[PDB]
UniProtKB/Swiss-Prot annotation:
Species of the source: Meleagris gallopavo (Wild turkey)
Protein's name in the database: Ovomucoid
Residue numbers of the full-length protein present here: 130 to 185 of 185
Signal peptide region: none
Swiss-Prot/TrEMBL domain comment: Avian ovomucoid consists of three homologous, tandem Kazal family inhibitory domains.
Subcellular location: Secreted
Residue ranges of every copy of the Kazal-like domain listed in the record: 2-56
Disulfide bonds: 8-38, 16-35, 24-56
UniProt-annotated site: Reactive bond 3 for chymotrypsin, elastase, proteases A and B, and subtilisin, residues: 18-19
Glycosylation site list: 45
């Protein structure tokens, strides 16, 4: 319960790297890592956002 969100002003990128940082959007959508979650923020106008860092 807070405003902890990642930044994706450099997305989207053609490479996710492959790490594993499951960021759950504020709608409960798990994204493998920051880039996968950041590609949703970029293709969503930022209407996604997250509610908690981790898997939903």
């Amino acid at each position: 319960l807070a405003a902890v969100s990642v930044d994706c002003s450099e997305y989207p990128k053609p490479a996710c790297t492959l790490e594993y940082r499951p960021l759950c959007g504020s709608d409960n959508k798990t994204y493998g890592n920051k880039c996968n979650f950041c590609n949703a923020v970029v293709e969503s106008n930022g209407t996604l956002t997250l509610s908690h860092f981790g898997k939903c």
